[PDB]
Amino acid sequence: LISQRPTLSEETVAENRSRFVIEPLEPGFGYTLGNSLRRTLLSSIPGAAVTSIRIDGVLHEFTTVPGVKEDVTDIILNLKGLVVSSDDDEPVTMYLRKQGPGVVTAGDIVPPAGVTVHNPDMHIATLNDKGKLEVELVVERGRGYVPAVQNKASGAEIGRIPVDSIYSPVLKVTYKVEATRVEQRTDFDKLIIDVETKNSISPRDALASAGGTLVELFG
Amino acid sequence: LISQRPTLSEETVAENRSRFVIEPLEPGFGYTLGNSLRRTLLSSIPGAAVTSIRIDGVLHEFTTVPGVKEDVTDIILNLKGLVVSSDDDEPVTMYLRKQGPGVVTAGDIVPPAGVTVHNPDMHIATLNDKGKLEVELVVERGRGYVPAVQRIPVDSIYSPVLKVTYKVEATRVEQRTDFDKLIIDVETKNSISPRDALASAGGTLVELFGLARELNADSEHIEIG
Amino acid sequence: LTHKRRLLALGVHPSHYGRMCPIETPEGPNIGLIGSLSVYARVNPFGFIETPYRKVVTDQIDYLTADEEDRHVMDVSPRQMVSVATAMIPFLEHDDANRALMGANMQRQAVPLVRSEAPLVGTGMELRAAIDAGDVVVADKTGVIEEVSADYITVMADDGTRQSYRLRKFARSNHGTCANQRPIVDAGQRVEAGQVIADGPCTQNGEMALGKNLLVAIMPWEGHNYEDAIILSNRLVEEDVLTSIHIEEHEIDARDTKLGAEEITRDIPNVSDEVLADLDERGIVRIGAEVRDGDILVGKVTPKGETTPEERLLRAIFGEKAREVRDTSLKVPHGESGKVIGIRVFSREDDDELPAGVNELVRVYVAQKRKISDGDKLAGRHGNKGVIGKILPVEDMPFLPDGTPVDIILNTHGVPRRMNIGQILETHLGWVAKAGWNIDVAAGVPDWASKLPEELYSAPADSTVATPVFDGAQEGELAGLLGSTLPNRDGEVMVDADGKSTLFDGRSGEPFPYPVTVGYMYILKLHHLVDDKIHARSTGPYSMITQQPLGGKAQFGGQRFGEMECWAMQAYGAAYTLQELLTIKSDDTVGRVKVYEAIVKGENIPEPGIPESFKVLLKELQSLCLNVEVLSSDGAAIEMR
Amino acid sequence: AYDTPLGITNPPIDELLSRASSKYALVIYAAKRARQINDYYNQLGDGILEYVGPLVEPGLQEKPLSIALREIHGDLLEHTEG
Amino acid sequence: VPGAPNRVSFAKLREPLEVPGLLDVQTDSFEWLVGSDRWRQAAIDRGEENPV
Amino acid sequence: DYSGRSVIVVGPQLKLHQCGLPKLMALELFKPFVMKRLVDLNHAQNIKSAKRMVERQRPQVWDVLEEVIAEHPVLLNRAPTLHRLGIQAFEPQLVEGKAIQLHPLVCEAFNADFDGDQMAVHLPLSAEAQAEARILMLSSNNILSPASGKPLAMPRLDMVTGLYYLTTLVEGATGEYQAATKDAPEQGVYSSPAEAIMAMDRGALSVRAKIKVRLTELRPPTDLEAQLFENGWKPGDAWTAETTLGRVMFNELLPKSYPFVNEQMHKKVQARIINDLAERFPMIVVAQTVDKLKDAGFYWATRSGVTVSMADVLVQKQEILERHEAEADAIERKYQRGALNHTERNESLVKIWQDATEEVGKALEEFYPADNPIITIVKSGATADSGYLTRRLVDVSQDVIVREHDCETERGINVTLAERGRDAHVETSAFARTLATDAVDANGNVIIERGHDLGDPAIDALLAAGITTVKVRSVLTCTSATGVCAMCYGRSMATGKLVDIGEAVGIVAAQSIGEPGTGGLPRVQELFEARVPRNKAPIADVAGRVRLEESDKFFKITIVPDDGGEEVVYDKLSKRQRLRVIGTEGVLSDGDHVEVGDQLMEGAADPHEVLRVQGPREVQIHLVKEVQEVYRAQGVSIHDKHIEVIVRQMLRRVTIIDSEFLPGSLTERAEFEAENAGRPVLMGITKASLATDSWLSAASFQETTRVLTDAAINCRSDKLNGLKENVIIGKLIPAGTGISRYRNIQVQPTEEARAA
Ligand SMILES: [Mg+2]
Ligand SMILES: [Zn+2]
């Protein structure tokens, strides 16, 4: 038994993604361990997303706002790409009010105390001289992917239109193992994980939440 | 976050063989740790085993052993099944020498203090009439299963676990019937019990996965509590 | 577009070549009687079908027909005998005529998706067939856009005239598919005549988009793609790539009834206040409200018979009254749900046009956003089709070393009987087009690029490609492109020259031992959907003449047990099971009520009676002047009654 | 062998067919006994008839038809064939 | 087409004759039926001089 | 009522007795049941309230649904229903989604491809109905096809390729065994099958290697077991063999008592194995064995590395055929003038075409290694009008059931059984039969005795004795007054055991012949309708020599009788109606000897002709012979007993010549023979079915008008004997569980168990 405890050391490639290297340990452990973190990263990272939204002029998703170029059903799909972070312990509502010709982006949204928008440059809708768009977005806690929570289940009457919520701070995770010195001198493996995030949290803090999830899991 | 409580149960088929279940598991948690459990049970548990052995009147010959009914190959496979618990952690040479007609049961091998032979009833070989055999074997601790290095270079089975297999099923109908139920079947040698064998694999994984937890302990994770 | 140009042949050959393709004949028993017109076919005033061609190679184009068949010497172009639906299948020459035929029918079965992403690899017919279909917004005169809104688009012509186009927004089609038009231009843009101003339902940037581009893996995956089934990534459900909107119309009418004229009102005879909570002052479901199975859409009452004692007592005790009435409300059909987009009401007060006696007519339109689900039928352009076996979470999927999971997982075993080669060709070209390529010419161009033009080299990622049917790509040029692949972010190459890659099992983590073919194939969402095709019935209405249950109405259709099924039931020797189906489950007037009673109490199920079908049989014999009598062992004749 | 039957497949039809003549006689065998058990469980059945059972240890929610199959498997009752 | 997107064609050949209006199968007949003035323009590049 | 349908999807994780049921479909289907248990508990006060609780899908009911669903079978069916295995029972499993999860093994029985297909579900209600589903119609109890006897649940298409890859052997593998040398010992040996797994996980072993290991819980081949032990089996004893790790893991799926195989699994080899497993073990063992073969077959199909691409497909042949084509073109410079020869031409074209085909066959295997995906799949063996005939087949034979164990008749029919110096039709004609007489060897020793099941082990045992022909009971010779008997019919193809009394064979025989309907179908209907052959063929009216006379007008065949009586001549026979084919073989020529039953020319003989020549019993042998030969030309496997049941109903009628009773109404043999001038009569199935006892069953068959008028005049009273009549009026069919002996059973507990 060649005994040297595994050592996890950080790295950096970009900001939203940074590599991690753990070395050394027994053969055959690279592929089974690196994937077990990937399955946990891609699913169980506690995230922040938008649950339901409400627009004053529209009563449902299948109408159009006067003056705007995108229909309501097309704006909801454009709002699905919103990356957001929030502690929030509670349901809170954001606000978006824009007027006149221009372009409504994610930066025009006013985040309440405790939440923040991480992609103010994202396009939402194009407004013209007659275009007036005011909306209200309810942000809530969660993880993974929950479909639209219908108001028939939780009475949130006609006004609100539920939207599919995606709490996934992770973007793309991969890995590759390099088992050096397979000769008669010794035997060990070492792997490197490539963890990427949506800018909601850093790769380092994402791996920590996946590590704490597994540590408390095995019993 | 909070999660519904799972259950860790054990059903013992035989003294050395038992199967465990974990119910329920959110999806998909069966395949995440299932394959990691089998790999951790198999190659991560410490144990002592045979590295290389040597007997009387061998070096020149290859196949046949005058003075015994078993050939060289068949004699190696028997001593591969020899279970030995050594805390020396270094190669120690045990000696086994028995003459006259009889059967060598590994109760005739003199174990150095610190090592033992857990199956004194195991059949090593049957002695030829008016024959004698004296074998010196190297035993050192290790991990997992290491092939022969290439005297008698042989395959060392370091881990006490022998056969481990796993599968997952679906239960817990309540409102989502796709909840995972992890099954795992482990056959172990008598050196240690399967229930203590699983704990060693779980203890090695929580410490291994603790390296990621210590990065930012306050990063929000899931807890059953 | 293909419903038009279709023709009935009721009244193969050389004259059928270039005039009417038997290639798009239906796969049913009507094959040969029904065909679609060829792409370039022209009709002579007398009815003769004139094929265009160029006399041999003269530049002039004359009408070819039986008159031109007398003196027959060069054809006008390829795909003369190929119709529009068939000409949109890439690598048409490789697939069999059967698979080519099925591919045409599969394309006209697609449903419009909310996203409407254009095909990555295809022919040149997507553009020409989209604008001429009529569901796309085309500019009449050259000019500049004055205003652009979701409602309409105005164009300021250089001539000074002003044209405007109102866009169909979520309009219910004939078969219930949402027809929605998206403006593709902005105010400052300058548009030429004939240009596409807005996309139709199944078009993107002016070309037909009947499906999406997805990452495919051709390895068999643990039997979940067994025999036809297809496995999908949960990403498709999360990102609404295969999601489609479906709208259905419901109608109900008013007076001119049997015992007098009834009125449509919010008031229901006896219901909880929470049941009508979503109903408005008139009694119609309010727009934007959600409706589940059984909810009332339009409230309505009928004239009463006004003629039980046990019910009047409770009525008098608690104070309720025998206010007439029979409840007749338009509820949502069992097994469907959605939101109410609009209501159209036609009343009698206003002078409107309506049938005689009918006072009020109101139509309610309900829309559904349908996620892709297991059981839905998907298909490609080559005729391949199959249900969705399973939807795997994105975590556990065969994924490239990038960590990029595959969207769908197909199976190989279909090839060594049907061979469908074209399906594999566009799969590799789909990856070639997604990642781009650069031939990296050194000391000239390779020999496979001999017949190629120069513009085809060095294309960036996500580039659409056009391969005409018979003049398109060939095998040599493909592998040459397979050798050239622009790597990804980190510079690693994900696909070799064989179109295969080493995928990692998302469950065990181990890599798949062999390289698996991956690529991008264009698949469609067929009109057959699980929500429409699932049926279940315990008890429901029954027909009048025959007391059997009745399927085909808005609720609770019963399944048919034919004689072929009765033959199998007899082969097993199960006498009781056969008797239960044909007497108390179907036709026993007093049977099916006493069984539902015994089941509720938990008692034994009683012995069946005489099926009504047999009692009707005896009367039919008596009316034919045949005296039939059912005699027991004694008591000579017994009368059913 | 057949490590352990699950649900409907328990008991095996091979060990059941030894208790009766044919597979059809097995159907009437357990079916009429299920009528007796379900009667007893609801309450005493038809005129001047006291119904008995269950004989074997009942399951948690075991159906009366599943009990009668376990009863026949243990030879806890005989029938007059034909 | 003026606003047509760029799609690389593997065909080394050329199609000189653009596809005629595929919807002309329905329009040309009904315009001939009613005797529209657009079908009366078929006598501009005339054939038989009478547009009956 | 209590029915529904949906689209089906693969259920690869299901057990053979299970089916995936959408929760909503199961909720509405069991709606009356859940409402009761919901009212038994206090969730709903009264039944009216529980109805709204189920209709509105309150989450309280889902826990209740799994209780009423547990151990409550359901019936699945996919239209069209061809054979009885088209309807089976399963154990419903609540499943998310609206589709139906179908087990991948029952697909062949349902003929269910997974492209947009739908299946219907029916919920049995009465205790009798549930018993018939759990015993008669259970999915695991129906494995063997009740037409040929072969298993229908045998793995296919992926589990074949998956098991083919696991058990195949590759030399030079990573963990290959190497014999001991003077330097080092044998390196391919492993202590146990568990070690090889640990070696497989590391880069030391390939599952397809040639290693030799020691196996304890696995029993050895029977050939080597006698040499090694001869003292008994070895539950705990050990032994060593040289196999592949996959072949070891494969044999663990099989029963422990079954001996080792050590072969790469073909499609025929697996079928060969499942057959022998079904006989020697109860079907539960065979059900779970095939279920274990499914997991491994699917598991290794993914690791098999089977994938398609350009390389594995793209066509060499271009240059080959461009060369061969020029030879045929130059033949026109010869066929024109100088070298045609008018028969070298046709012979040259056929030889050159087949030569190119031979070179193409070599080029097909010249461009691919044997591991090619398409080639691997090929090697493993993975890859509407009929309803008219079937209904007539059912209409005539629906009443044929087994009514008694044995009729004790002493005369059967002769079976060819193994020409040697081995008939391939013995599995259809000789298999699963019962001997009417003992099988006696010439040496005097008796082997398989009369009244034996005639299993396949008996055929091989009889083949060792070297006996050609055997006499076997048949339904054609059955003397039963009502229906047939169990002994004459023999082993049930589905059960593998003696046919039960309640069994209704006529319908099973009709379906067995009707399903393959999907030299062809028009010829099959000609025989069963007993019409005159399209081209009539001469049969010998007497035995003797033959004089062949050839004339332009027509052939002439004159038979010189051995008796010396008047010659029999067969005149005016079209010359294109070729002569019949014959220690010394050949084709019939002038002067040959011809027996009474020999067919003189190639074609079809008039079935009415042979009736008056050879007798009624030789007609049924001839009819089944020609019918079986048609389905054999297409590769269909149907046991002769199914056809024999249909042919039995044709000759049941005899024509009374004249007056005692009166003219030639087609009567019944038993009714005429058992009570006291008539003829044997062959008639079609349509005419025979209309002659059955009941009138309102014949009224539903064909032309109700004519049947009713005659039945009205004679005042014919229907005794409700057949099962069609009981189906019409809703009675219990007199077959299976409706038989008087079965439905009159009295159930009472033993007094020994009552007091306890
Ligand atoms: Mg199908
Ligand atoms: Zn008989």
Residue numbers in the entry:
A (entry chain A): 2 to 220
B (entry chain B): 2 to 151, 161 to 235
C (entry chain C): 440 to 450, 466 to 510, 515 to 531, 570 to 803, 806 to 1139
D (entry chain E): 25 to 106
E (entry chain C): 23 to 74
F (entry chain D): 423 to 737, 740 to 807, 867 to 904, 911 to 1007, 1027 to 1090, 1095 to 1171, 1175 to 1191, 1203 to 1282
Study authors write:
Semisynthetic derivatives of the bacterial natural product rifamycin (e.g., rifampicin or Rif) are components in the first-line treatment of tuberculosis and other gram-positive bacterial infections. Resistance to the rifamycin family of antibiotics commonly occurs in clinical isolates as a result of point mutations in the antibiotic’s target, the DNA-dependent RNA polymerase (RNAP). To study the inhibition of RNAP by Kang-like congeners, we solved X-ray co-crystal structures of Kang A in complex with both wild-type Mycobacterium smegmatis (Msm) RNAP and a RifR RNAP variant carrying the most commonly observed RifR mutation found in Mtb clinical isolates (Msm RNAP βS447L). Our structural analysis revealed that Kang A binds the same site on RNAP as Rif.
While Rif was inactive against an Msm RNAP βS447L mutant (corresponding to Mtb/Sau RNAP β S456L/S486L), all three Kangs displayed potent activity against this mutant. We propose that the additional interactions with RNAP contributed by the unique Kang moieties (K-sugar and K-acid) stabilize the binding of the Kangs sufficiently to overcome the loss of interactions caused by the S447L substitution, leading to an IC90 for the Kangs against this RifR RNAP that is at least two orders of magnitude lower than Rif. To test this hypothesis, we determined the structure of the RifR S447L RNAP in complex with Kang A and compared it to the structures of the wild-type enzyme bound to Rif and to Kang A. The structure was obtained similarly as described for the wild-type enzyme and was refined to 3.45 Å. In the wild-type RNAP, S447(OG) forms a H-bond with Rif/Kang A(O2) and this favorable interaction is lost with the S447L substitution. In addition, substitution of the Ser by the bulkier, branched Leu residue has complex effects on the Rif binding pocket;48 the path of the polypeptide backbone is altered at L447 to accommodate the bulky substitution, and as a consequence the β-subunit loop from residues 451-465 becomes disordered and nearby parts of the antibiotic binding pocket rearrange, resulting in the loss of nonpolar contacts between Kang A and L427, G450, L449, and R456. These structural changes do not affect other RNAP/antibiotic contacts including, importantly, contacts with K-sugar and K-acid. The binding of Kang A to the S447L RNAP results in a reduced buried surface area of 2940 Å2, a loss of 390 Å2 compared with Kang A/wild-type RNAP. Thus, the loss of 390 Å2 of buried surface area with Kang A due to the S447L substitution is more than compensated by the 450 Å2 of buried surface area gained from the K-sugar and K-acid interactions, supporting our hypothesis.
